[PDB]
Amino acid sequence: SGFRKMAFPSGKVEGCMVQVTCGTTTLNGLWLDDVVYCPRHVICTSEDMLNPNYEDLLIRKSNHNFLVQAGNVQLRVIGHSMQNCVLKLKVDTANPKTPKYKFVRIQPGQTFSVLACYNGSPSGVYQCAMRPNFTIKGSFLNGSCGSVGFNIDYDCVSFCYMHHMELPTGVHAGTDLEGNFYGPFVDRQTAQAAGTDTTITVNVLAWLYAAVINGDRWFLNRFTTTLNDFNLVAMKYNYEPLTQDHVDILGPLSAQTGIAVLDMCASLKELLQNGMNGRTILGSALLEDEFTPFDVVRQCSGVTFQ
Amino acid sequence: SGFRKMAFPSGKVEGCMVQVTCGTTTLNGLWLDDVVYCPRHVICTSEDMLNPNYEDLLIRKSNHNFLVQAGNVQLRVIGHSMQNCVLKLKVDTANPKTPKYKFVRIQPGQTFSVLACYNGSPSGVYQCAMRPNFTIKGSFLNGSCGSVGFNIDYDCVSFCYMHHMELPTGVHAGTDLEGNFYGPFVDRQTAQAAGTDTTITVNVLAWLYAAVINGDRWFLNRFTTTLNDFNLVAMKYNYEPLTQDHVDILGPLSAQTGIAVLDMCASLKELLQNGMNGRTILGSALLEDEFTPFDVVRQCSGVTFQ
Ligand SMILES: *C(=N)[C@H](C[C@@H]1CCNC1=O)NC(=O)[C@H](CC1CCCCC1)NC(=O)[C@@H](NC(=O)OCc1ccccc1)[C@@H](C)OC(C)(C)C
Ligand SMILES: *C(=N)[C@H](C[C@@H]1CCNC1=O)NC(=O)[C@H](CC1CCCCC1)NC(=O)[C@@H](NC(=O)OCc1ccccc1)[C@@H](C)OC(C)(C)C
């Protein structure tokens, strides 16, 4: 028993991190087979950031302008290309530590582990969710760009996030590994802001199921609710609407605990209406929304990875 | 910016995990050089657990009774010995992925990352503290024994914890890597209980410094307090006493923020007296005590590891 913010083991990704240096800018890159992926604003200078035209900027670069360091080893760039907001540097050496991997673009609400890096060197790993406003509440300092977010399924690494920028409220924006930003953000230093966020309802419900699996039942009640009446209360508290698809996904957790999904909804409704009244759930005094139904089942049942 | 429960990258430890099978019992072991470390209750059977005499039990075992699996590879045991509550299986092959490492026994209050494993396969990584009552609030299911807790300093892995048992309140007990339990617990299935826990004062203060580094100042006040008067209020709220050593350790964080340690204490005093009044600190509605002063500096300044 117990329940923790659990990240995936990071070793398969650690063996892919490298340093990419161009001009006066150093950041991280991801080395898979003979290609190194990194944010295209590495080719920007301190005066290009305002409204850069990356196509102009890139046609002006030579291969030898890109300095790629993998440990104590320099890789030579033999080609480059831009795909949306990511730069792809072809190098003459295939990374022998390349895991099995996919690139996937995730939906708001899904979670992933972030391996935070500086100068191609991993610093720490933590669990994140893509927020409904397509930011992530990360932990990132200067030089962290090019750090990736990821999931693992058995032996396959599904990369879903590369870090690009911090927004004025201290939250973070980035792209999938094909260079498409999550959300309306763009990689130029112009006024942008996160947009109003909401709480991921389906995830709060899964975490309440986790609490029941772990012995916390104080928040349950005998009541039930309809989906309509639940969603009417959720809107008032700035919660994402719950759909029938969400209900269906919460099926396995419902059947294992014996608490119908709509009954757990009735319970969350009273938690929103009455607060927690100085009590905690799974060590939290807040309703936690960064565990998906899959995260709960994974941790409360013990799925491993090779 | 941002602040997260950050674990160390786990790859150096992933390459050391193996499966150890003896009779009807499977658990995890730690393979460093030509030795595999694992909990000695692997040699117990379902009827030995009540009051086992491990010396009796072990002299009755042969090397070929221990089945050690490293991936798709069986290792042959060529010797065994018991050191306190850990079993050391000498195998004929040195682990080529052995990182630089130390074994260290930590003090209550120190934090570490846990790589949770089943059947020698890593499942997830998360950050823990050793609680003042020498338990850890882990996340552990059947088969998780032999999972280790660890810190990393540049390139060196300091192993500090191996998992052995869960206690009736759902918290966890284990040993250092030389087999000495943290706390008064023993590895026999007899009535044991955690003992009264306290909040790690020095860590709460460090986390309040983290919040100031990240832009939260709403909890500060103009007041100050003496150490004596602070400790008188801490005892009342079941907080560990703060010593001058603690004050000294909080020096760097004091100097970087410009908030004297005793002023931050005055702030924590009013937080304990008045609660947080529906506000949050670093996304938490509770006073968080599982970050050390070192954790804060590491994450708010970006220390990496090779
Ligand atoms: C990458 N290594 C770096 C990571 C940042 C640094 C601190 N935390 C992080 O996550 N990324 C940047 O520093 C990045 C440089 C790029 C961004 C794209 C365009 C080319 C330069 N800059 C930022 O993240 C800045 N954010 C930003 O410009 O957002 C748009 C904006 C501009 C003006 C006013 C409001 C919003 C950060 C560093 O700047 C602030 C917002 C002050 C943190
Ligand atoms: C290892 N793989 C396993 C990990 C546990 C399982 C669930 N979560 C975990 O962390 N360890 C055990 O299952 C372990 C077996 C050993 C323990 C030492 C002696 C030889 C057998 N057992 C336990 O962790 C049990 N705890 C326990 O016995 O504590 C002492 C006790 C005994 C009776 C009454 C109160 C306290 C667990 C599995 O049992 C309970 C407490 C019911 C969870």
PDB file of C-alpha atoms in Angstrom, chain B residues 117-235:
ATOM      1  CA  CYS B 117      10.657  -3.037  -8.438  1.00  0.00           C
ATOM      2  CA  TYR B 118       8.823  -6.316  -8.966  1.00  0.00           C
ATOM      3  CA  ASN B 119      10.549  -9.497 -10.196  1.00  0.00           C
ATOM      4  CA  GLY B 120      13.758  -7.524 -10.712  1.00  0.00           C
ATOM      5  CA  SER B 121      11.957  -5.148 -13.117  1.00  0.00           C
ATOM      6  CA  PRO B 122      11.742  -1.441 -12.229  1.00  0.00           C
ATOM      7  CA  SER B 123       8.196  -0.127 -11.898  1.00  0.00           C
ATOM      8  CA  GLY B 124       8.514   3.559 -10.940  1.00  0.00           C
ATOM      9  CA  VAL B 125      10.617   6.079  -9.081  1.00  0.00           C
ATOM     10  CA  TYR B 126       9.585   8.498  -6.356  1.00  0.00           C
ATOM     11  CA  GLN B 127      11.043  10.649  -3.588  1.00  0.00           C
ATOM     12  CA  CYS B 128      10.808   9.658   0.119  1.00  0.00           C
ATOM     13  CA  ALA B 129      11.950  10.919   3.501  1.00  0.00           C
ATOM     14  CA  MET B 130      13.044   8.832   6.454  1.00  0.00           C
ATOM     15  CA  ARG B 131      10.467   9.892   9.023  1.00  0.00           C
ATOM     16  CA  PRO B 132      11.503  10.762  12.587  1.00  0.00           C
ATOM     17  CA  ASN B 133       9.974   7.431  13.693  1.00  0.00           C
ATOM     18  CA  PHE B 134      12.226   5.594  11.165  1.00  0.00           C
ATOM     19  CA  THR B 135       9.439   4.536   8.822  1.00  0.00           C
ATOM     20  CA  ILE B 136       8.996   5.764   5.264  1.00  0.00           C
ATOM     21  CA  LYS B 137       5.678   6.545   3.594  1.00  0.00           C
ATOM     22  CA  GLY B 138       6.326   4.415   0.533  1.00  0.00           C
ATOM     23  CA  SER B 139       4.296   2.871  -2.242  1.00  0.00           C
ATOM     24  CA  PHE B 140       4.926  -0.873  -2.178  1.00  0.00           C
ATOM     25  CA  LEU B 141       3.001  -4.035  -3.060  1.00  0.00           C
ATOM     26  CA  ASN B 142       3.754  -7.742  -2.794  1.00  0.00           C
ATOM     27  CA  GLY B 143       7.108  -8.579  -4.355  1.00  0.00           C
ATOM     28  CA  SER B 144       8.545  -5.114  -3.785  1.00  0.00           C
ATOM     29  CA  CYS B 145      11.060  -6.285  -1.141  1.00  0.00           C
ATOM     30  CA  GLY B 146      14.646  -5.658  -2.119  1.00  0.00           C
ATOM     31  CA  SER B 147      13.785  -2.365  -3.865  1.00  0.00           C
ATOM     32  CA  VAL B 148      16.346   0.225  -2.771  1.00  0.00           C
ATOM     33  CA  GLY B 149      16.370   3.884  -1.881  1.00  0.00           C
ATOM     34  CA  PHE B 150      19.260   6.026  -2.975  1.00  0.00           C
ATOM     35  CA  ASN B 151      20.897   9.397  -3.518  1.00  0.00           C
ATOM     36  CA  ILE B 152      23.307  10.455  -6.253  1.00  0.00           C
ATOM     37  CA  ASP B 153      26.280  12.808  -5.877  1.00  0.00           C
ATOM     38  CA  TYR B 154      27.854  13.643  -9.234  1.00  0.00           C
ATOM     39  CA  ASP B 155      28.634  10.133 -10.478  1.00  0.00           C
ATOM     40  CA  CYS B 156      28.347   8.175  -7.212  1.00  0.00           C
ATOM     41  CA  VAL B 157      25.231   6.277  -6.113  1.00  0.00           C
ATOM     42  CA  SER B 158      24.776   6.368  -2.311  1.00  0.00           C
ATOM     43  CA  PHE B 159      22.437   3.495  -1.470  1.00  0.00           C
ATOM     44  CA  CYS B 160      20.663   4.090   1.832  1.00  0.00           C
ATOM     45  CA  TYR B 161      17.565   1.863   2.031  1.00  0.00           C
ATOM     46  CA  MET B 162      16.374  -1.595   1.106  1.00  0.00           C
ATOM     47  CA  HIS B 163      12.698  -2.459   1.502  1.00  0.00           C
ATOM     48  CA  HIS B 164      11.616  -5.303   3.862  1.00  0.00           C
ATOM     49  CA  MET B 165       8.103  -4.901   5.237  1.00  0.00           C
ATOM     50  CA  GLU B 166       4.890  -2.947   5.575  1.00  0.00           C
ATOM     51  CA  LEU B 167       3.495  -2.066   8.995  1.00  0.00           C
ATOM     52  CA  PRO B 168      -0.224  -2.128   9.892  1.00  0.00           C
ATOM     53  CA  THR B 169      -0.691   1.624   9.317  1.00  0.00           C
ATOM     54  CA  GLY B 170       0.437   1.136   5.703  1.00  0.00           C
ATOM     55  CA  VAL B 171       3.910   2.685   6.181  1.00  0.00           C
ATOM     56  CA  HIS B 172       7.129   0.861   5.461  1.00  0.00           C
ATOM     57  CA  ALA B 173      10.231  -0.374   7.253  1.00  0.00           C
ATOM     58  CA  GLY B 174      13.578  -1.510   5.955  1.00  0.00           C
ATOM     59  CA  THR B 175      17.332  -1.568   6.378  1.00  0.00           C
ATOM     60  CA  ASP B 176      20.442   0.187   5.227  1.00  0.00           C
ATOM     61  CA  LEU B 177      22.426  -1.832   2.700  1.00  0.00           C
ATOM     62  CA  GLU B 178      24.443  -3.450   5.488  1.00  0.00           C
ATOM     63  CA  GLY B 179      21.212  -4.979   6.813  1.00  0.00           C
ATOM     64  CA  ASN B 180      20.590  -2.838   9.891  1.00  0.00           C
ATOM     65  CA  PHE B 181      16.958  -1.837  10.263  1.00  0.00           C
ATOM     66  CA  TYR B 182      16.115   1.790  10.569  1.00  0.00           C
ATOM     67  CA  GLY B 183      14.206   2.011  13.840  1.00  0.00           C
ATOM     68  CA  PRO B 184      13.340  -0.750  16.316  1.00  0.00           C
ATOM     69  CA  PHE B 185      11.752  -3.038  13.735  1.00  0.00           C
ATOM     70  CA  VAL B 186      12.765  -6.669  13.225  1.00  0.00           C
ATOM     71  CA  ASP B 187      12.198  -9.055  10.302  1.00  0.00           C
ATOM     72  CA  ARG B 188       9.730 -11.462  11.895  1.00  0.00           C
ATOM     73  CA  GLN B 189       5.934 -11.439  11.623  1.00  0.00           C
ATOM     74  CA  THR B 190       5.171 -10.305  15.161  1.00  0.00           C
ATOM     75  CA  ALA B 191       3.185  -7.329  16.408  1.00  0.00           C
ATOM     76  CA  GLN B 192       5.155  -4.166  15.638  1.00  0.00           C
ATOM     77  CA  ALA B 193       3.930  -0.612  15.159  1.00  0.00           C
ATOM     78  CA  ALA B 194       5.420   2.585  13.782  1.00  0.00           C
ATOM     79  CA  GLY B 195       5.585   4.790  16.875  1.00  0.00           C
ATOM     80  CA  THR B 196       4.461   8.411  17.070  1.00  0.00           C
ATOM     81  CA  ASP B 197       5.779  10.510  14.193  1.00  0.00           C
ATOM     82  CA  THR B 198       6.664  14.208  14.142  1.00  0.00           C
ATOM     83  CA  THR B 199       7.010  16.817  11.409  1.00  0.00           C
ATOM     84  CA  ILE B 200      10.529  17.546  10.140  1.00  0.00           C
ATOM     85  CA  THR B 201      10.790  21.224  11.103  1.00  0.00           C
ATOM     86  CA  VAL B 202      14.042  22.039   9.292  1.00  0.00           C
ATOM     87  CA  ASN B 203      12.537  20.673   6.054  1.00  0.00           C
ATOM     88  CA  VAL B 204       9.325  22.725   6.312  1.00  0.00           C
ATOM     89  CA  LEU B 205      11.495  25.820   6.680  1.00  0.00           C
ATOM     90  CA  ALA B 206      13.563  24.908   3.619  1.00  0.00           C
ATOM     91  CA  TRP B 207      10.365  24.439   1.599  1.00  0.00           C
ATOM     92  CA  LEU B 208       9.138  27.856   2.744  1.00  0.00           C
ATOM     93  CA  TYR B 209      12.454  29.193   1.409  1.00  0.00           C
ATOM     94  CA  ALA B 210      11.751  27.345  -1.839  1.00  0.00           C
ATOM     95  CA  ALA B 211       8.396  29.122  -2.042  1.00  0.00           C
ATOM     96  CA  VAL B 212      10.063  32.506  -1.598  1.00  0.00           C
ATOM     97  CA  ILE B 213      12.627  31.653  -4.294  1.00  0.00           C
ATOM     98  CA  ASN B 214       9.655  30.853  -6.555  1.00  0.00           C
ATOM     99  CA  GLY B 215       7.613  34.011  -5.836  1.00  0.00           C
ATOM    100  CA  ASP B 216       5.240  33.048  -2.955  1.00  0.00           C
ATOM    101  CA  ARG B 217       5.700  35.636  -0.177  1.00  0.00           C
ATOM    102  CA  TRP B 218       2.160  35.888   1.277  1.00  0.00           C
ATOM    103  CA  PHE B 219       3.085  33.983   4.467  1.00  0.00           C
ATOM    104  CA  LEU B 220       6.001  36.187   5.548  1.00  0.00           C
ATOM    105  CA  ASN B 221       5.636  38.689   8.375  1.00  0.00           C
ATOM    106  CA  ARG B 222       7.679  41.450   9.916  1.00  0.00           C
ATOM    107  CA  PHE B 223       8.101  39.590  13.225  1.00  0.00           C
ATOM    108  CA  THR B 224      10.983  37.538  14.539  1.00  0.00           C
ATOM    109  CA  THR B 225      11.352  34.929  17.266  1.00  0.00           C
ATOM    110  CA  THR B 226      14.039  33.349  19.382  1.00  0.00           C
ATOM    111  CA  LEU B 227      14.956  29.702  18.936  1.00  0.00           C
ATOM    112  CA  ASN B 228      13.594  28.951  22.422  1.00  0.00           C
ATOM    113  CA  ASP B 229      10.250  30.635  21.770  1.00  0.00           C
ATOM    114  CA  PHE B 230      10.009  28.924  18.389  1.00  0.00           C
ATOM    115  CA  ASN B 231      10.700  25.462  19.818  1.00  0.00           C
ATOM    116  CA  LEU B 232       8.048  26.067  22.493  1.00  0.00           C
ATOM    117  CA  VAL B 233       5.451  26.537  19.742  1.00  0.00           C
ATOM    118  CA  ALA B 234       6.793  23.643  17.647  1.00  0.00           C
ATOM    119  CA  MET B 235       6.463  21.091  20.456  1.00  0.00           C
TER     120      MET B 235
END
